[PDB]
Amino acid sequence: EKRDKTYLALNENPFPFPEDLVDEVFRRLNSDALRIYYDSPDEELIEKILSYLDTDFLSKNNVSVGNGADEIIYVMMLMFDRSVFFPPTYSCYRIFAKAVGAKFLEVPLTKDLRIPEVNVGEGDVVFIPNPNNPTGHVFEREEIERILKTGAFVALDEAYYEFHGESYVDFLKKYENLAVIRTFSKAFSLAAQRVGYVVASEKFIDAYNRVRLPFNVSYVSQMFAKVALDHREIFEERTKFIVEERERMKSALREMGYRITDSRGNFVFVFMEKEEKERLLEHLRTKNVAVRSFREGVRITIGKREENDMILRELEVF
Amino acid sequence: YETEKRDKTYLALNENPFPFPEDLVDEVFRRLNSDALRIYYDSPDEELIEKILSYLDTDFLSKNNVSVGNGADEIIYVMMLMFDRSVFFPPTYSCYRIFAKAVGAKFLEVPLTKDLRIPEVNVGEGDVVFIPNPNNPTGHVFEREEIERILKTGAFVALDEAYYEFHGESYVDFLKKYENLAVIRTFSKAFSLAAQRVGYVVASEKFIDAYNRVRLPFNVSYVSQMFAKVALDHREIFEERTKFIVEERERMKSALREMGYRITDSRGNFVFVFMEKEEKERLLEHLRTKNVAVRSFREGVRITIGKREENDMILRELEVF
């Protein structure tokens, strides 16, 4: 419960799915297909995905799909002896591994938000959300190779790719124990239609395809992803801003005297308080505002310009 | 890719013979709020699960005894993740063994009697016995006492009612006495909505409680629920398609019996015809010859009920044998 319009606690894109494309979806959907068991990754869908990644080596067999980016996570943890992530990370990593009955190990990130040091090992799968959530910061070239080199299978959660220039999807030219997970939930405003895709070695995809549900991505959902991909410039325009807006109020918070993460996502992270923030959380609530409460600060999602200025205003009267 | 078999006449996946009501498609997109797509729509819809109850038509069931999944499959899937051991009896739904392995759960397969009866297996609490009913692929129906038996052992019963619409009854009114039971349904067969993956679980508030704690939070898409919702608000249309199919079935069974074939009392949207291998295969290559696909099983073939003209065709072929 509770969403009284001004909600910035789930990294949801502020803009609704373009009405235009909504009309192009079923002006393309056959009412006769709805009755059969529609091919999970659509042969067309993958092709358009390949173009999106715009690489010169991967093919059809290096890409698969999942009911939201969540399913890829959920299933991977089922196919590895142990899942290891580094808090502060995606709160679900913990929830999922606990529901799957999987073996996991949480190792706190360094005070500098650097990757910790611990075991390694083939048979393990370590999740590295990059840019990280909720901090939003980015991991350096080396830190990822560090784990890759241990033999352990790394799972790069690049859900916030769009809001950050590059993605290490080129490590697939040199590593087989890697996988790049992504989604349309944030940059394409399709969070409601659950559509995610992973990218790895051919050995992993079918290995993956054998564990995931046979038909996990609906016919209609699959259309939205294709439609959205053929009008990506539209969304690549919505991003330019979210970034301009983000990196704008970041300077605004640094001004108000707040300590923030060098977030590179569709959100900003205001640090450290707790009973100061558990306080401002009470302040924002009487203002219908809603951010994401964490340990070591709160994470706020970049909404519309009015919502953005909102945050700053209410954040200075504190 | 397993479904690479899509021929002019496909009756191998128990799919519905007609496309989703055209008009009804324009209604799901009529009440489709564009601003919802950008958000994480609530797992089950308050309205959706409101409708289901309506459908379920009962007095004891409440918004808490029901839940949804990405198609009946995910319900089975997560279920094998909750219990220590799953127990099913072949011939049964093929994905029970596939998912059990995939997920990595401990299973036990115990063959049904020669009379399609559930044998006595000392199962008990901690185990989850899957019992599709009507069964797949025989399509036969198990008796009250047959299920209530296992139920009294302590074991959990996953009564898969994926073919309820084609069979009058349902053991939903069992939750009144038992809690170690859960009924599973789907919109894929009766509502030509198999491409939108939507299913629902009916069980004790304590079970739904757990389940929801194991399934992905946002497993059913906004539009998917939308399709299920409008579909339910016009069930009438579908009730008719179901009427047709069962009639088209019983008709098909009688024609087959007369032809001297050994069939089952299928109460689903398909017919099962036993065939002694070396004669069965001739039939397959003969059908694959006439561009016809039917699911092949150990004891015979499962023929899905299609459009009037398709069924008539099937009857014509099985006659020349």
CA distance B121 to B252: 35
Residues of chain A contacting B104 with CB distance shorter than 8 Å: 78
Q: Is the CB of A189 inside 8 Å of chain B's CB atoms?
A: yes
The DSSP code for B194 is: G
CA distance A21 to A294: 36
A112 Cβ contact list (under 8 Å, min separation 6): none
Across the interface, do A37 and B224 touch by the CB < 8 Å criterion? Answer: no
Order of strands across the sheet with A297-301? A267-271, A297-301, A292-293
Q: Is the CB of B96 inside 8 Å of chain A's CB atoms?
A: no
CB B250 within 8 A of CB B263: no
CA distance A119 to A104: 12
Residues of chain B contacting A67 with CB distance shorter than 8 Å: 70, 216, 219
Q: Which residues of A284-318 are buried (b: 16+ CB within 10 A; e: fewer)?
A: beeeebbbbebebbbbbbbbeeebbebbeeebeee
Distance of CA B121 to the CA centre of its chain: 24
Of B38, B71, B219, the CB nearest to A16: B38
B110 Cβ contact list (under 8 Å, min separation 6): B87, B89, B119, B121
| Structure-token pair, residue A138 | 């980015």
CA distance B187 to B231: 9
A197 Cβ contact list (under 8 Å, min separation 6): A41, A49, A63, A64, A65, A66, A72, A181, A182, A183
Q: What is the 3-state secondary structure (H, E, C) of A215-275?
A: CCCCHHHHHHHHHHHCCHHHHHHHHHHHHHHHHHHHHHHHHCCCCECCCCCCEEEEECCCC
Q: Is the CB of A207 inside 8 Å of chain B's CB atoms?
A: no
CA distance B250 to B29: 37
Residues of chain B contacting A214 with CB distance shorter than 8 Å: 2, 73, 95
Across the interface, do B38 and A22 touch by the CB < 8 Å criterion? Answer: no
The identity of residue B52, as a single letter, is: I
Q: Which residues of B263-302 are buried (b: 16+ CB within 10 A; e: fewer)?
A: bbebbbbbbbbebeeeebeebeeebeeeebbbbbbebbbb
Across the interface, do B34 and A19 touch by the CB < 8 Å criterion? Answer: yes
Maximum alpha-carbon separation in chain B = 60
Across the interface, do B34 and A22 touch by the CB < 8 Å criterion? Answer: yes
Across the interface, do B34 and A14 touch by the CB < 8 Å criterion? Answer: no
Distance of CA A115 to the CA centre of its chain: 19
CA distance B271 to A226: 38
* Conformational region of residue A62, where left means phi above 0, alpha means psi within -120 to 50, and beta covers everything else: alpha
CA distance B101 to chain A (A): 9
Q: H or E stretch including B183?
A: strand B181-186
* Pick from A20, A28, A81, A12: nearest CA to A233: A20
The DSSP code for A62 is: G
| Structure-token pair, residue B99 | 């998912």
The DSSP code for B44 is: S
Of A12, A34, A211, the CB nearest to B19: A34
The DSSP code for B263 is: B
Q: Is the CB of B9 inside 8 Å of chain A's CB atoms?
A: no
Across the interface, do B195 and A221 touch by the CB < 8 Å criterion? Answer: no
CA distance A60 to B29: 31
Q: What Å resolution does this PDB entry report?
A: 2.8
E-assigned strand segments in chain A: 63-66, 82-85, 103-106, 124-129, 153-157, 178-183, 196-200, 267-271, 292-293, 297-301
| Rounded (10°) CA dihedral A289, A292, A297, A299 | -90
**Which chain A residue has the Cα nearest residue B10?**
A36
Across the interface, do B38 and A14 touch by the CB < 8 Å criterion? Answer: yes
Euclidean distance between the first and the last CA atom of chain A, given in angstroms as a whole number: 27
CA distance A4 to chain B (A): 13
Residues of chain B contacting A68 with CB distance shorter than 8 Å: 216, 218-219
Cα distances from B134 to residues A175, B93, B165, B289, in angstroms, run 49, 11, 10, 31
Residues of chain B contacting A96 with CB distance shorter than 8 Å: 216
CB B268 within 8 A of CB B288: no
Question: What is the residue whose two structure tokens read 């500098």?
Answer: A112
* Angle CA B26–B30–B32, to nearest 5: 120
* Pick from A97, A85, A152: nearest CA to A124: A152
| Structure-token pair, residue A98 | 């606990």
Q: Is the CB of B285 inside 8 Å of chain A's CB atoms?
A: no
Q: H or E stretch including A73?
A: helix A68-76
Q: Which B residues 61-80 touch A at CB under 8 Å?
A: 70-71, 73-74, 77
Pairing of strands A153-157, A124-129: parallel
Kindly report the number of other CB atoms within 10 A of residue B8's CB atom: 9
**Which chain A residue has the Cα nearest residue B198?**
A218
Residues of chain B contacting A71 with CB distance shorter than 8 Å: 216
CA distance B282 to chain A (A): 27
Peptide bond into B217 cis (omega under 30): no
CA distance B12 to B304: 6
Query: If DSSP codes are grouped into helix, strand and coil, which group holds residue A105?
Result: strand
Backbone torsions φ then ψ of B304, nearest 5 degrees = -75, 145
**What are the beta bridge partners of residue B134?**
none
* Pick from B119, B39, B124, B131: nearest CA to B92: B131
- One DSSP character per residue, A157-182 reads E-TT-TTSS---GGGGGT-SSEEEEE
Euclidean distance between the first and the last CA atom of chain B, given in angstroms as a whole number: 32
Backbone torsions φ then ψ of B55, nearest 5 degrees = -55, -55
Q: Which A residues 14-53 touch B at CB under 8 Å?
A: 14-19, 22, 25-26, 29-39
* Angle CA B56–B47–B244, to nearest 5: 45
CB B51 within 8 A of CB B233: yes
| Structure-token pair, residue A179 | 């996988």
Across the interface, do B15 and A37 touch by the CB < 8 Å criterion? Answer: yes
Maximum alpha-carbon separation in chain A = 59
* Pick from A235, A165, A157, A237: nearest CA to A197: A157
A213 Cβ contact list (under 8 Å, min separation 6): A40, A67, A71, B70, B71, B73, B74, B77
Choose, out of A35, A60, A65, A103, the residue to mutate when testing the contact with B (most B CBs < 10 Å): A35
* Pick from B249, B279, B278: nearest CA to B264: B249
Continuous H helices in chain B: 22-28, 34-37, 48-56, 71-82, 95-103, 144-151, 205-214, 222-232, 235-258, 280-287, 308-317
CA distance B311 to B249: 9
Of A74, A213, A219, the CB nearest to B196: A219
CA distance B240 to A199: 45
Q: Is the CB of B304 inside 8 Å of chain A's CB atoms?
A: no
CA distance B310 to A62: 39
Peptide bond into A116 cis (omega under 30): no
Residues of chain B contacting A17 with CB distance shorter than 8 Å: 34, 37-38
The DSSP code for B91 is: S
Q: Which B residues 120-179 touch A at CB under 8 Å?
A: none
CB A260 within 8 A of CB A53: no
PDB experimental method: X-ray
Across the interface, do B19 and A29 touch by the CB < 8 Å criterion? Answer: no
Choose, out of B216, B220, B304, the residue to mutate when testing the contact with A (most A CBs < 10 Å): B216
**What are the beta bridge partners of residue B6?**
none
**Which chain A residue has the Cα nearest residue B219?**
A67
Cα distances from A269 to residues A88, A133, A160, in angstroms, run 12, 9, 14
CA distance A214 to A257: 52
**Which chain A residue has the Cα nearest residue B102?**
A211
Residues of chain B contacting A185 with CB distance shorter than 8 Å: 40
CA distance A13 to B202: 34
CB B297 within 8 A of CB B234: no
Question: What is the residue whose two structure tokens read 């519905």?
Answer: B16
Query: If DSSP codes are grouped into helix, strand and coil, which group holds residue B265?
Result: coil
Q: Which A residues 244-283 touch B at CB under 8 Å?
A: none
- What domains does chain B contain, in order, with CATH numbers? 1-30+234-321 (3.90.1150.10), 31-233 (3.40.640.10)
CA distance A218 to A41: 10
State the count of interchain CB pairs (< 8 A) between A and B. 154
CA distance A300 to A267: 5
Query: If DSSP codes are grouped into helix, strand and coil, which group holds residue A153?
Result: strand
CA distance B165 to B187: 10
